[PDB]
């Protein structure tokens, strides 16, 4: 069976993950091994910089978290989740963590650098993706969620902003700031407004089904050019999501609509991904009938879009940000809170 080769794949993958989960990599480099080049991302949850490792010459993306800002934002345990999970995982469509370390002031996570930029920037520019184009990316997500959920991981922030395009035109999921290893239900309110399942909004206690709901949002946005539930302010977006009504553009194929009605399904006993058949309800769906799941895993499918290669440290696919100092205090901040990082 294809379901049995697959079960075998996941068994090996889990034994691999647990070994790193139970004994995490720690303190594997130092800031002064990296030359800083450019801020390619900034936000509430730290910034991301292009750097260059001197000993190898390799370019990398370095996420910096101010430990004091993390404590004030009450993201201590999420930050610890993020690093422990990213260091343990291993899958083609997950951005790979090369190093992590910390100093008196900061936490650092050095990832492989994707010069091609995020899906977001290309989706906005082009307007929308063709169904075949959107399906190609959706398949990568479907498989990644298959892998994550098999490890008891929920991702909780699927959106085009968190998806990077590599040099073969395949995607990498980045930012694990709200990922959590949980076997039961959980209750934290987190995610991005447009992508939130109704059960998060209504404060109910949820599981990995929220990840499949967010898949439906993503595929919709990719093929429509805009998301299924938008407005100018979050509370208005929440009223739309909980209403149970969604409108599709007249260009959506009738298979795409039917897939999306089962992903953006309020009723958890009916939502694709959450039922007795699990991820095969998605994988065997007619919209995906031309998808060869193994060749997508193997990166043998021809990509609809390969971004323009401008050098290994080129930054033209990212916007410009105001550059700040990386200041390292002479006193240790929050030693105890982050000891396991």
């Amino acid at each position: 069976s294809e379901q049995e080769s697959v079960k075998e794949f996941l068994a090996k993958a889990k034994e691999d993950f647990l070994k790193k989960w139970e004994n995490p990599a720690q303190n594997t480099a130092h800031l002064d091994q990296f030359e800083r080049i450019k801020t390619i991302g900034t936000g509430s949850f730290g910034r991301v910089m292009l750097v260059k490792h001197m000993e190898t010459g390799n370019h990398y993306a370095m996420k910096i978290l101010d430990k004091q800002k993390v404590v004030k934002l009450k993201q201590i345990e999420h930050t610890l989740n993020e690093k422990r999970i990213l260091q343990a995982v291993n899958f083609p469509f997950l951005v790979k963590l090369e190093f992590s370390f910390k100093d008196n002031s900061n936490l650092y996570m050095v990832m492989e650098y994707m010069p091609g930029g995020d899906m977001f920037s290309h989706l906005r520019r082009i307007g929308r993706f063709s169904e075949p184009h959107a399906r190609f990316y959706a398949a990568q997500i479907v498989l990644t969620f298959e892998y994550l959920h098999s490890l008891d991981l929920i991702y909780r922030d699927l959106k085009p902003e968190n998806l990077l395009i590599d040099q073969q035109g395949y995607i990498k999921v980045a930012d694990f700031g709200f990922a959590k290893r949980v076997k039961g239900r959980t209750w934290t309110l987190c995610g991005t407004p447009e992508y939130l399942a109704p059960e998060i909004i209504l404060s109910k206690g949820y599981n990995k089904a929220v990840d499949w709901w967010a898949l439906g949002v993503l595929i919709y946005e990719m093929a429509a050019g805009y998301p299924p539930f938008f407005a100018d302010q979050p509370i208005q977006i929440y009223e739309k999501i909980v209403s149970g009504k969604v409108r599709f553009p007249s260009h959506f194929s009738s298979d795409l609509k039917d897939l999306l009605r089962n992903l953006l399904q309020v009723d958890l006993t009916k939502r694709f991904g959450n039922l007795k058949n699990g991820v095969n309800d998605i994988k065997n769906h007619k919209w995906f009938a031309t998808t060869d799941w193994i060749a997508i895993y193997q990166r043998k499918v021809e990509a609809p879009f390969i971004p323009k290669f401008k050098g290994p440290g080129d930054t033209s696919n990212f916007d410009d940000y105001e550059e700040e100092e990386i200041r390292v205090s002479i006193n240790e901040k929050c030693g105890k809170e982050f000891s396991e990082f």
Binding site: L189, C190, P193, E194, G225, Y226, F230, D232
Partner: peptide
């Protein structure tokens, strides 16, 4: 159109995550 309403809205740039 729906696309035109989207493109005139304030939420066409990169969206931030929320938290309680």
């Amino acid at each position: 159109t729906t696309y035109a309403d989207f493109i005139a809205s304030g939420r066409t740039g990169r969206r931030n995550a929320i938290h309680d």
